[PDB]
Every structure is written in structure tokens, then in C-alpha cells.
Amino acid sequence: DPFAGDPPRHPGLRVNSQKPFNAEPPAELLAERFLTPNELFFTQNHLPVPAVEPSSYRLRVDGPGGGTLSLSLAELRSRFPKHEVTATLQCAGNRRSEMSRVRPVKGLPWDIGAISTARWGGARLRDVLLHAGFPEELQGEWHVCFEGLDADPGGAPYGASIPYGRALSPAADVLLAYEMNGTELPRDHGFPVRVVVPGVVGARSVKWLRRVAVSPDESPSHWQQNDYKGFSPCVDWDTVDYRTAPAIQELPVQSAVTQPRPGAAVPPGELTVKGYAWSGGGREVVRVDVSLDGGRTWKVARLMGDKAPPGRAWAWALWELTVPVEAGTELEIVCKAVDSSYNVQPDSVAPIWNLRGVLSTAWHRVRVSVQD
Amino acid sequence: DPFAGDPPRHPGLRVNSQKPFNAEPPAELLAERFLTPNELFFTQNHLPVPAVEPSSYRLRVDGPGGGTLSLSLAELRSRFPKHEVTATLQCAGNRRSEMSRVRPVKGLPWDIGAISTARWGGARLRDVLLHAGFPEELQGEWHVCFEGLDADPGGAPYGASIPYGRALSPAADVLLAYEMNGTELPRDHGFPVRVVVPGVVGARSVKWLRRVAVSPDESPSHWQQNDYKGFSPCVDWDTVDYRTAPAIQELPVQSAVTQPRPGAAVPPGELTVKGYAWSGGGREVVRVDVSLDGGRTWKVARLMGDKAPPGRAWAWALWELTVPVEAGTELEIVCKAVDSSYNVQPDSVAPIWNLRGVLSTAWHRVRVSVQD
């Protein structure tokens, strides 16, 4: 059994796949803290988790001339000044289950928790590429490809890429992280090294990093070429052409209600509605609107989190609204967020449906009742 | 009469205000060419158009030390290498009239044409600021403020600002343009010099430029402080607080059908539906979905325009779809676009309504009939 070596996990996780392991924190905890504890941080693994011996570990990074720099874990910690970045990882498949309610899709049935936040610490990718000899700017469209230590039966490793410009930008904060929420990277989250690409879909943050290579083309791996792309709602498995859409990089504006939960009965009087909101590309969320009546009237919720500099809002904003509720009434609780370029979330799922169930950002609707 | 000196305009424009002059090209022409002819390019003036004598004209630019560089038109053309940028200007109030159909708003009643595209030529703002002595990077949050030659009765000039980082970035392409579609700037469009801020709302492209100043704060002008901001649909004229929302800079994904027009009767057989689509922040539009039945089924339209580099899609994409139509049927034609960070347009206007009628990006719906 190729999965016998996997780490043990926290017992309260909402597991949707045991092998390979994929799970999300329970929604009643998801937004309980700004930083998600390492043991509740959602996990997405495509393969068995690699067992890595710290000192024999080497990160291979290909130089501009065809040579190969070979860094050990200790050298990565001491050569480069440690940088810390608090960033939210949201999986492309977050909220896929709401899509399945319209028309079945292919994929892990995530609810609203394929997203978590953490303070990451490690080397700036930028610094590692400069040390390897690359210039700050290459002419044309270049990419930085990553490969993990985890590989399938037939030898292919999980892989992804980001544009060279993003890798080199001081502002973009791309890290080769070896620390998570102040402790070392847990095995499930990439020990000893992973890439963390703030503002960008989870798929690009390659875990258990074994190689970094600069290339004129995107990563040729299956997960970069033939997956994680958005299509028209009309497209199906026989008409789908992966060359007609760009690989998902930055994600659109997103939000969900974490309290209360669907079906709940809530005491009359006052109700505190809580949730998260986030946007890709470092775009700050500037407002969250909340509705108790299915989206015909709205009030502005209160935002917490900490103002990050412009174009660098890598972390979610948690929100709450305490509102008056009348005994024996029916509520349809809805939330929607607005980002700094004023992008908004769409009303319904059907018009954004796609065969892979990714990019599910329609309003989150929660139905509950007020106790008599 | 303070407006006696205004330029004459093309006779076929859809004028919504004569003084000050505000007009849009007729929708049947809007998307007829990729570059909008200077005489049809939409015009938004807040005040009378300034009469400027070329040789006595001086652009005042404040240096880092409190000094003042003073450039003439000839020096602006010869000191700095001319750069050309094709960029679409969309006004914050575009499609405001669709908002008014839900609940009256305050503002010029634009239809779908408060948007146009042109090839601009002039000095890079960047180069002008470096010549003035500024560094490529200032610590903290800085702004570059602009003031036009046009001023109200009580002396205040039209003004706006953009973040310093945007002004200095080579990639961002901010220009002090003196040419438009190969000829000199027409008076209505800012002769002799205007700022052109690609990917950003029209309001920031200050026309008839008289001053450029770097400041730790945003432009203090009315149009930067107490206008051009987005609010919750619940907010009204007595609860509105302009300090709770950011000045609009980058705009969200947008699209509209230009052919056919509402109410048209179209021959049976085949129908070519045409329109535009655009997104702010240099984000390319990657798809346009078109529906003939009110948005329940969709087909992918065909895109034209020319692939710009990543993060620099400053120009709209024109689109068309030739579709089969049955005699004696009713059609509700709808279009929606998707940008490179996968942002999408919302289904309905009501949930994005705001008191100023700005940021109108819900699906454009056109109802027509097929002739028997």
C-alpha cells in the first residue's frame, strides 16, 4: 500500500478522500481564527505524501547557463534572509459541491473550506534565483517551473509554474517556505520545503519541492496543461479543449458564510452572522454585503484583518454582522464581497458552471429558521 | 456664456449634456472599428473646454525638493522618447442608465458607449518624473496628483491622482499624451496634453494637463475625494460616507452587445451578434459567452483584437457570434465576459445598485424579434 507512510491527521477534519488524502476544517472552525492552526489547515494531496530525510535533502535549481545549483535545507535557511508572509491558500475546487447541485461535475466534493490562512516563513524565490545567477528581467514570456517529490506510478511528479515576472518581483512575495505558523512545515503541507505563491490558486504552491527551473514555456505537467482552467457552461467532456483557456493563476473575489450553518434553528432576538472573504492578485476586499432575505435587501458587514499595503492583500478578511431576528421566521442568509478593482461575485451558479467544478464564486446562500 | 469657446463636434453623437459637453458615439458605430475615430470617441467634460495657445503653454511639474520644473510642449516632444500605447478609456458611469431602471440615480444618463479606444502617443510619465529628479521608488504610500487647466467658477481645477508605483512602472504605460490616433490631441480630448492611465477608470486621465505633483496623499480634489467610489446598494444620500470606500482605480470586467439594438426586427435565417468586452488592470478578456434565451443556454463568441503581453491588455476585445434564428420567435440576447484572473460579470443590476450610478457591469440584455 503506497499510502501506508502518510502522516496521521486531526480527528475532526471533514475528509472527502482518504487516499490520496483531501480534507477541510469543519466550517464552524474555519473562521474561528485569523491564522488557521496547522492541524486544521485544509489539505490537498494528489499522491502519497513523501517521506523525506532532512539532511540528505537537496533542492535542485537550474541556472541560466544549463548548470545546476544544489541546495540543502540548512543552506536555504542560512544563505537567504528569512522573509515572512501571511497568505491565504484557496483551492481551485473550493465550493465545488454547490456546482454539483446544478449538474454533476468531476472532482473532490469540497464544501466552503478548501481555503486556509497561515504565516509562512522561508527564502524569497527571487533571492534564490538571483543567487543562481539569473537577471531581474528576461526578455519575452518566461516561466519558473516547479516539481514536487511526490510522483505517480508511471514516474511523473506533481508540477506547476508561475510567470517569471511574478517569481522575481519583490512585491509579489513568492516564498520557498520551510516554516508554517511559526513551526516547521508539517509533512502534509510540504515538509521540508514548498513554494507559496500569494494571491494565486493553491495548485501552484508546489509542496515537497525537488526542483525549480526557468523555462520559455509553462510547466508541461498534466496539472498545468490539462486541468485547473475555466470553461464556458456549454462545454462538456467531449468538446473540451484545454488550449482555449489560460491556466488559472490569480483567483476572483470570493466569500462564504461560516455561521450559522444550513438548517440551523437559531434563538430569537439577535444573531451574529460570520464568514470569510478573499480576492486574488493581492486585491483587498473593500466590502462585504449580507442579506437575510435571499438577496433583495443588504447591510454592510464588519471587516477584521489587518490592512496590508496596496496590491499585497494576500490574506482573507474575516467578517461578522450582528442582526435582529424575529421568532418563527425563515431566513435566507447570503453574502457577497467586493475587491479593490471593484470586482463582484455573481448571483447564481448555473451561468458559471463548468465540467471540472472549479471557480465556484456565486453568492453563498444559507437557509435557517428562527425558533419560536 | 462660459461655453461659447467650446469646439464644434460631430453631428451624429448621442449628446446627454450640452454644457458641459458629454456625449457617446451611437451604439451602431461604437464597435465598428478597433480604434475609435477621434470625432466619435466619447467625451466627458465637467467644465468648459480650455482655449490653449501652444507656445505659451507650460506644464508645471514639482520636483522632490520643492522646486518646479516647467516644460513647454516642444520640450515634451523632443526631450523624451515618444511611446505609443493603445488603450481603452471607460468612464465610471458607463451603462448608468441600466441602473436608473431599478431606482433613479444622480448622474449623466450614459448608455453603453461611455467607452472608446485609441492609439495614444506621448512621453512616459515615468520618464518625466525621473527627469524631474525623483527616484524609481519612494518609501511608503505615495501619489502623483494631476490638475487640469479647466476650473470651476470658484477657482478649483479638475484634478485626480494615481499611486506613485503606477506612475513609475515601465509596464504600466502611463503617458502624458500629445497624440491621439496619429494626430494631435483634439481640444475635447485634452489638447495639448493629457494623462492617459491604461487599465484605470477614465476620471484619472486628466485632460488639459497643467500640473503634476508627487504627494504622500491622494488628490484632494472633489472628484478624487467625494465622487467616483462604489457603495453598498443600501446606502443613500443621507448615509453616504466617502471615507469608507477606495477611489475607483482599476475597473472590473465589462461587456455589452452593440448589434443588434433593443427592439429590432431581424430577418429569419442567420444573425450576427456583435459587441465589446474589456477589463481593468491590464487583465485580458479570455472569453465571452452569449445567450439568445435570457441567459439559460450559452455559446462562446469569437474574439478579435491583438494579444497584448500579460498584465498589459489595455484595449477592449471586440466580439461576434453568427447564430441561427427562427422566424417569428422572441430573443433575449445577453453577453458576459471573463478576464484573466477569472473575474466574471454579475447576473443582475439591483444587487450592485449604488446612488451615483457607477460600476454598472451586470449582463447586458437586448430584446429583439425575428421577422416572420
Ligand SMILES: Nc1nc2c(c(=O)[nH]1)N[C@H]1C(S)=C(S)[C@@H](COP(=O)(O)O)O[C@H]1N2
Ligand atoms: N507536490 C504537490 N504540491 C501540491 C499539490 C500536490 O498534489 N502535490 N496539490 C496542490 C493543490 S491543488 C493545492 S489546492 C495545494 C493545497 O495545499 P495544502 O494542502 O497545504 O493546503 O497544494 C498544491 N501543491
Ligand SMILES: Nc1nc2c(c(=O)[nH]1)N[C@H]1C(S)=C(S)[C@@H](COP(=O)(O)O)O[C@H]1N2
Ligand atoms: N481636465 C479634465 N480631465 C478629465 C475630465 C474633466 O472633466 N476634466 N473628465 C474625466 C472623466 S470622468 C473622464 S470619463 C475622461 C473622459 O475622457 P474623454 O473625454 O477624452 O473620453 O476624462 C477625465 N479627464
Ligand SMILES: [Cl-]
Ligand atoms: Cl479540486
Ligand SMILES: [Cl-]
Ligand atoms: Cl459619469
Ligand SMILES: [Mo]
Ligand atoms: Mo487545488
Ligand SMILES: [Mo]
Ligand atoms: Mo468618467
